[PDB]
Design a protein around this nucleic acid. Structure first.
Ligand code: ADP
Ligand code: BEF
Ligand code: MG
Length: 426
RNA sequence: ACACCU
């Protein structure tokens, strides 16, 4: 087993000199909470504290990044220290670079990939488009250290993915099913995997994904570092997560309860199911009169996604849809059209609810309320990325009554006005 | 339900 160098974080003197109270005040200013009893390095507060290669710093400055986000301030040094961790922070607040840039430093301290060598960093994600997005970010920065990456996911030909794995990648981004296929058939292996990331980790630990995660992680060396990330960390996944963690540290940004990004204006319209169509058209007529009008509309099922899109297109709306019954080339094409703005309206199932970072989305519409309050927080987080603001509009019916209590709590935490009809439902 | 190999 090639030796795993784990001790390479060098704390900057500007960070090391802070006293414990000063650290607590820095965390307070950034709304960082570290779970009690965990060992945790002091947070950094500038990119030059974070041990990054000069070429990574060059790329960061070229993209006009000036200061790490809160989850980066605490997550960079925790990840760099080699500790297992859980990092929870709001949608759009920079979790991807929080785990990718320490991955690059980690990789740079390991022996070079030989032949027959699988990846050093493995990132798991719940959807194919999110895996592709993370790989694009990783390539942007991994190229600085001459690192190779690939994306392993279903619906695309196996051959090119097998080629990339056999050529050698230090960084592999994957959805679980196709990776399991390749592990079972010997197209890659996890004997060099020492940095394992579960992005959208609470989703990856849910009823459908947890057995896939378990099958994968059972094949990885137990001396690996494991890093889990999400905007939501409900109690239900916390004990289960310990099956995949060893001596770990949990960090949070924002309130400890379930919380949305506070840059989102959250509007809830309480209505009957039969009123949704008319109300949607009214809303879209106002949205499409604006200059910045890029909109995602979420629905509950693939069938409703197809039906709503056809209904909208039949009336001349420039809408396209994405869901799991489309071919992967269709899914890729639609999302690229949405990113470019050639199609300003995307209608989607929860396939598009997590992780996707489309810069100029201004509106998220919950045509159907989702199955959980966590799903609501992720969906509305497709707007208000980075420092941007955005608006979410939700249609909430009496059929959704069971979800009302938790929705009210999310609205209250974000200091949003609560529709009296929603209150009257409880 | 929604994702997630074939
Ligand atoms: N330190 C930073 N300053 C400004 N923008 C950033 C910074 N870090 C990341 N971003 C940008 O913020 C956006 C959201 O990042 P992302 O990693 O997708 O969020 P999350 O995973 O937390 O939902 C991305 O476009 C990313 O380039
Ligand atoms: F939480 Be980010 F939207 F992935
Ligand atoms: Mg993310």
């Amino acid at each position: 087993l090639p030796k795993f160098e784990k001790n390479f974080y060098v704390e900057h003197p500007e960070v090391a000199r802070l006293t414990p109270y000063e650290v607590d005040e820095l965390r307070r200013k950034k709304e960082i909470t570290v779970r009690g009893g965990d060992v945790c390095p002091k947070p950094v507060f500038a990119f030059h504290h974070a041990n990054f290669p000069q070429y990574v710093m060059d790329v960061l400055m070229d993209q006009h990044f000036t200061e790490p986000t809160p989850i980066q301030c605490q997550g960079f040094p925790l990840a760099l220290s080699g500790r297992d961790m859980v990092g929870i922070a709001q949608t759009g607040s920079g979790k991807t670079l929080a785990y990718l840039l320490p991955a690059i430093v980690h990789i740079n301290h390991q022996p070079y990939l030989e032949r027959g060598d699988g990846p050093i960093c493995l990132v798991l994600a719940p959807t194919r488009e999110l895996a592709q997005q993370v790989q694009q970010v990783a390539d942007d920065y991994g190229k600085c250290s001459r690192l190779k990456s690939t994306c392993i996911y279903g619906g695309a030909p196996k051959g090119p993915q097998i080629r990339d794995l056999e050529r050698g990648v230090e960084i592999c981004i994957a959805t679980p099913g196709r990776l399991i296929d390749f592990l079972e058939s010997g197209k890659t292996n996890l004997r060099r995997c020492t940095y394992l990331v579960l992005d959208e980790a609470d989703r990856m630990l849910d009823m459908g994904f947890e057995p896939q995660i378990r099958k994968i992680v059972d094949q990885i060396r137990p001396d690996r570092q494991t890093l889990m990330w999400s905007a939501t960390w409900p109690k239900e996944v916390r004990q289960l997560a310990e099956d995949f963690l060893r001596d770990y540290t949990q960090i949070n940004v924002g309130n400890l309860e379930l919380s949305a990004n506070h840059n989102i204006l959250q509007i809830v319209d309480v209505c009957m199911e039969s009123e949704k169509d008319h109300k949607l058209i009214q809303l879209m007529e106002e949205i499409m009169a604006e200059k910045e009008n890029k909109t995602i509309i979420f629905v509950e099922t693939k069938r409703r996604c197809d039906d709503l899109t056809r209904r909208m297109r039949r009336d001349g709306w420039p809408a396209m849809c994405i869901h799991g019954d489309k071919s992967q080339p269709e899914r890729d094409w639609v999302l690229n059209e949405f990113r470019s703005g050639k199609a300003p309206i995307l209608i989607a199932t929860d396939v598009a609810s997590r992780g996707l970072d489309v810069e100029d989305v201004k509106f998220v519409i919950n045509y159907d309320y989702p199955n959980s309050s966590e799903d609501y927080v992720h969906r509305i987080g497709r707007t208000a990325r980075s420092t941007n603001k955005g608006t979410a509009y939700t249609f909430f019916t009496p059929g959704n009554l069971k979800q009302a209590r938790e929705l009210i709590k999310v609205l209250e935490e974000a200091n949003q006005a609560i529709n009296p009809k929603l209150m009257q439902l409880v």
